[PDB]
Amino acid sequence: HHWGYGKHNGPEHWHKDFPIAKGERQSPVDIDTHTAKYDPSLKPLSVSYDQATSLRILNNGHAFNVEFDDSQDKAVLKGGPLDGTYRLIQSHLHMGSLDGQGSEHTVDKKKYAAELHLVHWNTKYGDFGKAVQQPDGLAVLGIFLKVGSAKPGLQKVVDVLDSIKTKGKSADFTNFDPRGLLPESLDYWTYPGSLTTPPLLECVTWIVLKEPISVSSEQVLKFRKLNFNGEGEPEELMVDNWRPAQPLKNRQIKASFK
Ligand SMILES: [Cu+2]
């Protein structure tokens, strides 16, 4: 019924309800490190996540989510390919069923265990709603996740996952710090893209970080136990909720690093 990631409602079906699914700037895409090119005009990336603004954590049937207070500029994104200030409004995790898959964007065909997305909107549009209606309304920072050492900033979250196991559930969480999710390096690739889930609006400036972060298998496994389904329904594990790479058409992927 509702769009999804199954065989009967997965990505390859979306185009029937959202013709833009076959647009000219769809995400995610595969990053060919030796096709993408350094762009000397890109300014430095500014990830000012000083004042934490996390509010809720929830299961919306599509993925694990975190909502932030976007009333002020307490967590914004500036610099890089961006013109203006972009406000962080939410974050979600794309998880795989196996350690070898999960990420939406790929690097030279390589898939990661998962991909985190931090969504920000151009504060020049009044609100999120009017932003997505614009080509330069969104800025999504994508962060790759590989299995290994445990990520501290994720434990506290992983500890209360059972409180949002099924769709429609949510738990207050003012404890979430998007700083604890960032890798050491802020090198990235940027390209004009879209949302990776319906409506698939082509309103996104993508900033994918080259350096992945590590998470333990315990943390991963706990994320693989969320459910696509609601309470009192046949269990459907929330895994492989990622859209495969889309045609780059002839878009240019730029590197922030030489
Ligand atoms: Cu996403």
Side-chain angles (χ1 to χ4, degrees):
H1 182 2
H2 194 22
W3 60 262
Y5 298 96
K7 178 63 144 153
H8 309 150
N9 64 355
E12 84 271 17
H13 269 273
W14 297 355
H15 86 274
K16 290 178 260 165
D17 280 308
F18 304 91
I20 199 53
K22 322 243 238 201
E24 301 292 288
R25 349 149 23 186
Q26 288 288 281
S27 300
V29 298
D30 175 71
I31 296 160
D32 187 336
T33 67
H34 298 283
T35 270
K37 80 199 284 215
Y38 170 70
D39 188 349
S41 96
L42 289 178
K43 321 254 83 166
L45 215 228
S46 186
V47 190
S48 336
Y49 284 168
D50 23 32
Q51 283 149 287
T53 47
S54 97
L55 304 162
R56 314 145 84 175
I57 233 95
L58 61 80
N59 180 335
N60 69 348
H62 143 232
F64 155 79
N65 271 267
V66 178
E67 251 138 49
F68 304 89
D69 158 12
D70 59 342
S71 54
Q72 331 272 180
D73 285 349
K74 289 162 295 153
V76 299
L77 215 55
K78 324 185 234 159
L82 316 188
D83 252 65
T85 304
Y86 283 74
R87 243 180 245 186
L88 174 76
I89 184 161
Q90 75 108 248
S91 181
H92 53 282
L93 184 72
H94 292 276
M95 178 68 65
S97 80
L98 293 159
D99 293 7
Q101 62 199 61
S103 87
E104 296 213 307
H105 286 89
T106 54
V107 185
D108 285 344
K109 295 311 223 248
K110 185 205 163 96
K111 288 170 176 92
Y112 287 78
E115 178 161 350
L116 199 97
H117 287 151
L118 307 224
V119 198
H120 323 69
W121 58 270
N122 204 313
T123 58
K124 120 194 165 200
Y125 287 130
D127 72 32
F128 183 74
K130 308 154 167 130
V132 311
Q133 305 298 52
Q134 310 296 140
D136 69 335
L138 295 203
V140 184
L141 191 54
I143 303 165
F144 292 134
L145 272 93
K146 22 107 84 320
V147 168
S149 272
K151 191 74 180 212
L154 234 37
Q155 211 16 269
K156 52 241 239 7
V157 155
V158 169
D159 288 337
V160 314
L161 279 197
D162 337 69
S163 83
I164 57 169
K165 179 166 119 104
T166 53
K167 135 260 292 246
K169 309 295 259 60
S170 55
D172 289 5
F173 213 93
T174 38
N175 249 170
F176 204 71
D177 192 335
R179 290 209 250 91
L181 291 171
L182 313 170
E184 271 181 20
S185 174
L186 287 185
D187 284 346
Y188 63 88
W189 290 287
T190 186
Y191 76 96
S194 77
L195 285 163
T196 11
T197 57
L200 297 167
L201 273 8
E202 301 181 327
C203 58
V204 191
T205 292
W206 280 96
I207 309 187
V208 169
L209 290 182
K210 170 221 68 243
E211 178 186 342
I213 56 160
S214 265
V215 291
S216 76
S217 60
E218 306 65 72
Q219 282 168 334
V220 150
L221 259 6
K222 287 219 62 193
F223 264 124
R224 300 194 176 144
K225 312 245 257 31
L226 293 168
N227 287 174
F228 276 129
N229 64 283
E231 218 181 350
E233 291 196 16
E235 178 163 272
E236 284 162 41
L237 295 175
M238 193 167 257
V239 298
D240 290 325
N241 58 331
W242 49 277
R243 183 194 199 180
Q246 297 306 308
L248 181 60
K249 293 324 247 222
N250 290 115
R251 295 173 275 172
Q252 317 213 69
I253 306 190
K254 317 238 131 247
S256 71
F257 47 105
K258 257 202 227 209

